[PDB]
């Protein structure tokens, strides 16, 4: 019945610092209650550190020693993770987790309750809205069959973008791909949908793109390309 | 530091089948090992702790065994909600406390060939100096697939990126995009753009292509 609520997403330049918080909604709370773990995109879990009970001694992953500080305010039931001299490989989802009872083997129990995670992006890039381009249905779409169409959502930073079709009314056949990070440092993704070929002349298919970080919203109608 | 190694990286199993996941430690951790489940977009959740104890709220089909260096998580009969990534972790040796690299359990279903589609770059994008060409592989299984781009019969490499969806909740298939990125100058120097797809469900590779500037 205790819940752990973390602060919102962060976007930072290399060399800067970030401070993420995690607040418990109730229950007994000490500075040792909450540990921090992170997970880089597509990777596994990496322990950052926690606080040893009684001695109240923070203990950190050796690779981050000197850059990472974990503190807690018992009066507000909030733990803080501060990571400085940030590097691109610090880009990750950062999680707080409650440490359970250690049984007969102090100082650590298991991670029995988790926060929702906080996305931290470290990059030299600056906020930029996407360009949206049509993925137009082929002129050789099978007559009476199925056609694919889509939108290419290119060159934006940071994550995330959302895509819907027909203002959320069209979900049958939709696939919105995870974004890829390009060597330029900007993200791109596509969203596609399959539709009846025979509908391409009369039904409208619109991708609704929203990149909230740049306050950029675009609706693009995608249709067969006209010949000359 | 105690390194935890998980095996295999991926298990492909049907609903109802038994899953056996391995975690091996580089030196003994006694019984101080746990297993977590993690689904896309969610935090991990504790399943089994101190090798064999089941966390409250966790179904009886999950059991852990082992001691010392060799541990196993067994899911006696897989439910749809069990397809996920599983991590082991030790709580005894630190710093750092360590996790295994994870094992993904994914749904085995019948082979399904992709439906393939190619998309030329838009005229609007071309005005900006870059051409993106997209190849879509729709609703296929298993996930392994080979996509090869050809431009005027030249095999491309180094200039494409792939993205894949998670397994579909309705039909357990995957979809995949491959995006070929060219400068406008390179794009306008060539005619035939083709994506060739090889997949277990296809009795011959599928090629989809267009000629630049032709309807």
């Amino acid at each position: 019945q205790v819940q752990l609520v973390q602060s919102g997403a962060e976007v930072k330049k290399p060399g800067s610092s970030v401070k993420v918080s995690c607040k418990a909604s109730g229950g007994t709370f000490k500075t040792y209650t909450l540990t921090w773990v992170r997970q880089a995109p597509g990777q596994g879990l990496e322990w950052l550190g926690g606080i040893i009970p009684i001695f109240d001694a923070p203990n950190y992953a050796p690779k981050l020693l000197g850059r990472l500080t974990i503190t807690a305010d018992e009066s507000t039931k909030t733990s803080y993770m501060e990571l400085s001299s940030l590097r691109s490989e610090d880009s990750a989802i950062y999680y707080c987790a409650r440490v359970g009872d250690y049984g007969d083997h102090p100082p650590w129990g298991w991670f029995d309750l988790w926060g929702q995670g906080t996305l931290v992006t470290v990059s030299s890039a600056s906020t930029k809205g996407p360009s949206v381009f049509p993925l137009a249905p082929s002129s050789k779409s099978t007559s009476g069959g199925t056609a694919a169409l889509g939108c290419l959502v290119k060159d934006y930073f940071p994550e995330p973008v959302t895509v819907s079709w027909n203002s959320g009314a069209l979900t049958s056949g939709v696939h919105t791909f995870p974004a890829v990070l390009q060597s330029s440092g900007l993200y791109s993704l596509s969203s596609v949908v399959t539709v009846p070929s025979s509908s391409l002349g009369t039904q409208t298919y619109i991708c609704n793109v929203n990149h909230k970080p740049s306050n950029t919203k675009v609706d693009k109608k995608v249709e067969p390309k006209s010949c000359d | 530091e105690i390194v935890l190694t998980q095996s295999p990286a991926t298990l492909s199993l049907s609903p109802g089948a038994r899953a056996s996941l391995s975690c091996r430690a580089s030196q003994s951790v006694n019984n101080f090992l746990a297993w977590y489940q993690q689904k896309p977009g969610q935090a991990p959740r504790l399943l089994i702790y101190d090798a064999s104890k089941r966390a409250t709220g966790i179904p009886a089909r999950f059991s852990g065994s082992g001691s010392g260096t060799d541990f196993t998580l067994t899911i006696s009969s897989l439910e749809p909600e069990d397809f996920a990534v599983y991590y082991c972790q030790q709580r005894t040796n630190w710093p750092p406390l360590t996790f295994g690299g994870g094992t993904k359990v994914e749904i085995k279903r019948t082979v399904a060939a992709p439906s393939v589609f190619i998309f030329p770059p838009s005229d609007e994008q071309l005005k900006s100096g870059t051409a993106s060409v997209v190849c879509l592989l729709n609703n296929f299984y298993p996930r392994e697939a080979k996509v090869q781009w050809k431009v005027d019969n030249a095999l491309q490499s180094g200039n494409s990126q792939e993205s894949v969806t998670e397994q579909d909740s309705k039909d357990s298939t995957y979809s995949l995009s491959s995006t070929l990125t060219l400068s406008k100058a390179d794009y306008e120097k060539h005619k035939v753009y083709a994506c060739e797809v090889t997949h277990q469900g296809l009795s011959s590779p599928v090629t989809k292509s267009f000629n630049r500037g032709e309807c």
């Binding site: 009684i54 250690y102 102090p106 100082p107 | 005894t92 630190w94 710093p95």
Partner: peptide, 23 residues
């Protein structure tokens, strides 16, 4: 240097220090 599990369990050889974890 940072505390570590070897040094920590060495400290808990003292029964009074171990007792801090089992009041």
């Amino acid at each position: 240097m940072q505390w570590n599990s070897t040094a920590f369990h060495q400290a808990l050889q003292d029964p009074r220090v171990r007792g801090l974890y089992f009041p």
